[PDB]
C-alpha cells in the first residue's frame, strides 16, 4: 500500500546506466535509500520514502542528477497529478519490482 515519491530519469546514451547501477549510484552519491528502482533502454524511474525524502535532496537530485563516468543522467520530480498518472500507468511495474 506504500506509495513513495516518484522520480524520473533520462540518459544521454544507452548502456551508461542500469537499475542496479542507478540504485548504487543514487545511494552513494546522495546517501538515500530507494525502495523502488526501474530502468528501461534509455530512461528509468526511482522512488524515495517520504520520511527519507527532503527538499534539499530533491533540489540536489534535479540539479546534479546522477553521474555515470563521462555521461550525465537527468532527474525529474513526479508529484501531484504526475504521481497519480505514474501509479495508474506503471502500477503493475511498481508492484512487480516491490514484490521482488
Structure description:
By secondary structure, the protein is α+β, with helices and mostly antiparallel strands. It has one domain: Alpha-Beta Plaits (2-Layer Sandwich), CATH 3.30.70. It contains 3 helices and 5 strands, in the order E-H-E-E-H-E-E-H. It has helices spanning 19-30, 55-64, 81-99, and strands at residues 5-10, 36-39, 43-48, 66-68, 71-78. It has a 5-stranded antiparallel sheet with strand order 2-3-1-5-4. A hairpin with a 3-residue loop joins strand 2 (36-39) and strand 3 (43-48). The protein is globular. It comes from Tetrahymena thermophila (strain SB210). GO terms for molecular function: RNA binding. Keywords: RNA-binding. This is LA motif RNA-binding domain protein.
Distance between the termini: 15 Å
Rough outline: globular
The CATH topology, please? Alpha-Beta Plaits
Strand order of the largest sheet: 2-3-1-5-4
Determine the oligomeric state from the structure.
monomer
Biggest sheet overview:
5 strands, antiparallel
Q: Please, how many helices? A: 3
Helix and strand succession?
EHEEHEEH
How many beta-strand segments?
A: 5
- The structural domain count equals 1
Query: What is the rounded Rg?
Result: 13 Å
CATH class: Alpha Beta
Quick rundown:
By secondary structure, the protein is of the alpha+beta class. It is built from 3 helices and 5 strands, in the order E-H-E-E-H-E-E-H.
Amino acid at each position: 500500500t506504500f506509495q513513495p515519491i516518484i522520480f524520473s530519469t533520462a540518459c544521454e546514451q544507452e548502456g551508461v546506466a542500469n537499475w542496479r547501477n542507478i540504485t548504487e549510484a543514487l545511494l552513494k552519491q546522495h546517501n538515500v535509500h530507494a525502495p523502488y528502482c526501474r530502468f528501461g533502454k534509455l530512461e528509468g524511474n526511482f522512488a524515495l520514502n517520504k520520511d527519507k525524502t527532503s527538499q534539499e535532496v530533491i533540489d540536489q537530485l534535479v540539479q546534479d542528477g546522477l553521474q555515470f563516468g563521462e555521461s550525465k543522467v537527468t532527474i525529474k520530480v513526479s508529484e501531484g497529478e504526475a504521481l497519480s498518472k505514474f501509479w495508474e500507468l506503471h502500477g503493475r511495474h511498481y508492484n512487480g519490482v516491490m514484490e521482488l
